[PDB]
Amino acid sequence: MSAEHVLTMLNEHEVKFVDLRFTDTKGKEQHVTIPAHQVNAEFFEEGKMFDGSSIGGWKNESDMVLMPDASTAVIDPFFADSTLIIRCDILEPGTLQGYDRDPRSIAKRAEDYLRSTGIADTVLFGPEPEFFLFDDIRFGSSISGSHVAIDDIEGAWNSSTQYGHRPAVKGGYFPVPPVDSAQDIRSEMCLVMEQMGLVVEAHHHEVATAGQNEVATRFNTMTKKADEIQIYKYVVHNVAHRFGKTATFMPKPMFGDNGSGMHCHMSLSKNGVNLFAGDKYAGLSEQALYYIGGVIKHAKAINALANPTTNSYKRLVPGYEAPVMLAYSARNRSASIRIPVVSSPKARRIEVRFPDPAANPYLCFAALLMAGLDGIKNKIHPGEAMDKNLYDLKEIPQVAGSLEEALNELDLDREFLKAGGVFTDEAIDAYIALRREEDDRVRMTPHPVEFELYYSV
Amino acid sequence: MSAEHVLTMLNEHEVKFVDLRFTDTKGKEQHVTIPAHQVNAEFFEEGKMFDGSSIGGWKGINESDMVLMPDASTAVIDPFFADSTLIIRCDILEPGTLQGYDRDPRSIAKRAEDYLRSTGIADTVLFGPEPEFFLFDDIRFGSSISGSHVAIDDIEGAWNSSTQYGHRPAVKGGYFPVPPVDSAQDIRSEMCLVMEQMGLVVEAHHHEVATAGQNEVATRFNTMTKKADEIQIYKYVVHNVAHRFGKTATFMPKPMFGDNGSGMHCHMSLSKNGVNLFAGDKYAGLSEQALYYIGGVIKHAKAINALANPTTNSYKRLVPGYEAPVMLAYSARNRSASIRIPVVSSPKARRIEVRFPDPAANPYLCFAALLMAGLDGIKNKIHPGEAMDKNLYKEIPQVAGSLEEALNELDLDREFLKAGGVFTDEAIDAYIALRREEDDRVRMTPHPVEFELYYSV
Amino acid sequence: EETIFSKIIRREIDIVYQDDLVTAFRDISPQAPTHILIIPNILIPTVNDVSAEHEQALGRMITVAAKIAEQEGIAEDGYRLIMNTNRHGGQEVYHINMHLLGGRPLGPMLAH
Amino acid sequence: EETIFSKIIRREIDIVYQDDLVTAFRISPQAPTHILIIPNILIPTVNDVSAEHEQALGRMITVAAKIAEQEGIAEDGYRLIMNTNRHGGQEVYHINMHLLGGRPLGPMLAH
Ligand SMILES: *P(=O)(O)OC[C@H]1O[C@@H](n2cnc3c(N)ncnc32)[C@H](O)[C@@H]1O
Ligand SMILES: *P(=O)(O)OC[C@H]1O[C@@H](n2cnc3c(N)ncnc32)[C@H](O)[C@@H]1O
């Protein structure tokens, strides 16, 4: 679309309010609403001034410009009044250039750097988020202690709860519609997503009980796919709220059951041909192997962006169907990087399984793309594939086991993100500080399991 | 003690009632009380006639009465009744003939001892049972057409860490805790004191592995019939002391799932003219007679299982993968062997330890079955084979996996325990019928776990 | 002192092959479908006690192993030569005994 | 024809002990003390051992004992395992005797 198209759409749909939306460093979507009559031709050329001091990690004077993107005009399906959602970029007031800490500006810089390197023209992302549907969640903390309570009908622990078909633990994958009580909610989510520009492939119940559901969305270019992931999170949250449920994208909400993950499919295209298709292992090319090697080498530094929460590392544990070995294979379930089998060379891609849904889409995608580009530029070989049985069987590098370790690796390993000006040093420092605050909070607070273990000793 | 000693004891303690006690086929202790003035010289020569038709397996088509013949050597003052009561254990004898009733367990044990003396192998047999029990604050169970339920509650239970009313033993972690953690120190001390007051000899008492109050009081060995009487006194003492402390004591094999069960390790020793026949120059200091005893126990072990594991719950703890051994082999170091050889300082105390029997077993019947199996092995010279010493270089048999299998084996292999008239075919048939009634009741009723598996399918 | 394999060397008591320094015997309890043992003719307690004097026979052990594998025809299928020592591995002979396991597709090295 | 160990002998590409006919290496630790021994002369498979090069076979175990004394594992227990052809799992396609120890070793093979 364009500015004129948005102006015509305002009259066509009788729009009353225009919502300007943007994403902070944490990944949350912020929005400011303005009346429809306040949108003019000069609005798309000058933007709206706003203060980013209250936004975490964006802190003498913090007056910044909200520049709307007319190509992202989407009618809000949930607001009572007719509202048009326009995604916006954060720009500096004077130079009118992308803010260094703006995730969308960083993603656009990464795409521009990819185009400038001459390696490829476009990058394609295929993330597959997962979410949990709950009826009631209660958490709190104080000097007296802390607690968390998760309750929903589909939970296997409600077999005898006063108020009988519900999924068992680790057995909610593809159940009957009576047991899978999340069919109408998923269908409504798919319809709302299609109303908002998303293309939905399939939706199904996930392995974990207590209402884990997955809605599959078609791939797109990196920045558009990150915007689509933001819209996906928004619609999931709101449609869950409208049905009396609550939706969370937390990686490991409960122990003893499968966690939520975000497998990302990556591909590179130049002049309309797939650069990851060749005659190497699993139908890949030399550039695909270089991309895999670059991802593997900087994977621990990636974890600070693709796994920014401490629950993401309670998911990334040996066992429990969460890959931790940083190898690539087409059949090995333990490999973090997987090469899916496809019918045509045009759809050959590389799948990374360690990222979590709580990750910032822009930052995670930019980090993965920059790692792959560094691997291609430096010609980093991924090594031999982990698809061989050596004498029926520990030097394989492992994904970062804690948020502190990932943040330290990100602090030490910075060049692959600083190449091309995609990630400035100040933005990385601010992100590290923001994540370290949460790490300190989670580390300093006593755990109930600590009481179960070390109260009588 | 003789009848005169019993009369003098009655006069000295101002005893007002005399309790005549005996054990039925199921193992329960049945008692009938009479006034002290009804006890005289002719009482010990003629006994008291009673109707045993109401007893479980003592029914007869002729509805004949039976005689309660007191044993003066078993006189002991009851420590729980408000009035002074003297407990006298009695044997069930047929009228006129004044011979031991065929279905009376004590008469069967006496017959087994007489057969052991008559065969000439040994003069005395020593038993070293080590019963375990659970202490529960409250137990609620029920069954009906609408369903069944069981609920166990105790302060020491690990599940009560959040129950409103904080040192408790963890699951499989109640073995030798600090005095604050285990709340049964005073109860066990009182049990030991009152057991020693009743003629028992106590070695040690301690908390056992399972949570929710599993305790063991060790008692010294004795001859077979006297040791069975001591086991009955042990059960009575445990039950009454638990009742007087506001607790509930159970000798059920596997009251809880996921926690250690209750077992009764039995130690065997044959003595002739004061020397221990089980001491020799064979494996682990054993003799040839001891090896033949082990072989006889192994060969008939399934037949013994009907008497040493009378209950369906007895095979909930005999499932492989727990503390209770299941393999039909003997070793001095291997934990998986059902027959163990304890290490002792002197040959005078060398014994054979069998570990499959449960505390729910009838003491007289279980001891008689084990002794008869050992005697058959000695007479037929059944070599057990080789010890289960795990070397890094003929499938090992196993105990019965269900009560039905053990009952069938007892029905088929009943000749070893019919030698010398220790058991008569009517006794085995009645015992099998009573155990099959319980087996049918357990098998024909729906299980709550079945609803967790076969309700949505 | 000596072991039962010393008696077998003396021929006082299933010989597969005989040589001045190396002999091959069938296992009493074959742990593999084709389990053939190999020992030196000179009594040596452990391989830890091997000196350069008898190191000539140690190569003859492997040569006899190859010859026996070819004779049995298990050369193409594959075989494993195991020579355990000391407390680990269940050394219960206290004499040099090379194991030749073959026929069945064998498992992994060690036990894991 | 030639394997990785062939280039390792030429030093064209973690040596523990080097001899005229025997070289020792430390590459994926399967045991706390996993050290390999190969012949300097290339032998594709142990069945193809010729009597001309059969003398280094004894020096293999001699070096193994020397290493076990050096490694301090001779007081615990060790195995000398040679895998051959497909059933053994010959991966380097060259003679390679494994000196493994440092922890209680299991049985000869896993059932
Ligand atoms: P470990 O290598 O210590 O045990 C060697 C095995 O050799 C077998 N074996 C022992 N004795 C004989 C005889 N006399 N004949 C054939 N095979 C024998 C056993 O399997 C030992 O475990
Ligand atoms: P198989 O019984 O042939 O065992 C294969 C062993 O080869 C070792 N290995 C392969 N490649 C190397 C290199 N480059 N350096 C050292 N060791 C190597 C593996 O350690 C296997 O144990």
Author numbering:
A (entry chain A): 1 to 59, 62 to 165, 171 to 400, 406 to 469
B (entry chain B): 1 to 165, 171 to 398, 406 to 469
C (entry chain D): 3 to 15, 18 to 116
D (entry chain C): 3 to 15, 18 to 30, 32 to 116
Which of the paper's sentences describe this entry?
AMPylation (adenylylation) is an evolutionarily conserved PTM characterized by the covalent addition of adenosine monophosphate (AMP) to the hydroxyl side chains of amino acids in protein substrates. We developed a strategy to enrich for AMPylated proteins using the histidine triad nucleotide-binding protein, hinT. Although its physiological substrates are still unknown, in vitro characterization of hinT revealed high-affinity purine nucleotide binding and phosphoramidase activity. To investigate the structural mechanisms of AMPylated protein binding to hinTHN, we used AMPylated GlnA (GlnA-AMP) as a model substrate.
We solve the cryo-EM structure of an AMPylated protein bound to the nucleotide binding pocket of hinT to provide structural insights into the mechanism of substrate recognition and specificity. Focused refinement of hinTHN depicted the flexible loops of GlnA-AMP extending into the binding pocket of hinTHN. The hinTHN dimer binds two GlnA molecules, with each hinTHN subunit interacting slightly differently. Some interactions are similar between the subunits, such as Ile32 interacting with the adenine group. In addition, Met113 extends into the binding pocket of the neighboring hinT, coming into close proximity with the AMPylated amino acid, Tyr398, of GlnA-AMP. His103 of both subunits are next to the phosphate group of AMP, likely making polar contacts with the oxygens of the phosphate group. The structure of hinT bound to AMPylated GlnA depicts the AMP moiety of Tyr-AMP bound in the nucleotide binding pocket with unique interactions that precisely coordinate the phosphate and purine ring. Notably, Glu96, which is in close proximity to the phosphate moiety in E. coli hinT, is not conserved in human and T. marianensis homologs of hinT. However, the negatively charged glutamate may induce repulsion, contributing to the reduced affinity for AMPylated proteins observed with E. coli hinT. The structure of AMPylated GlnA bound to hinT provides a platform for protein engineering to optimize the binding interface to alter specificity and sensitivity for AMPylated proteins.
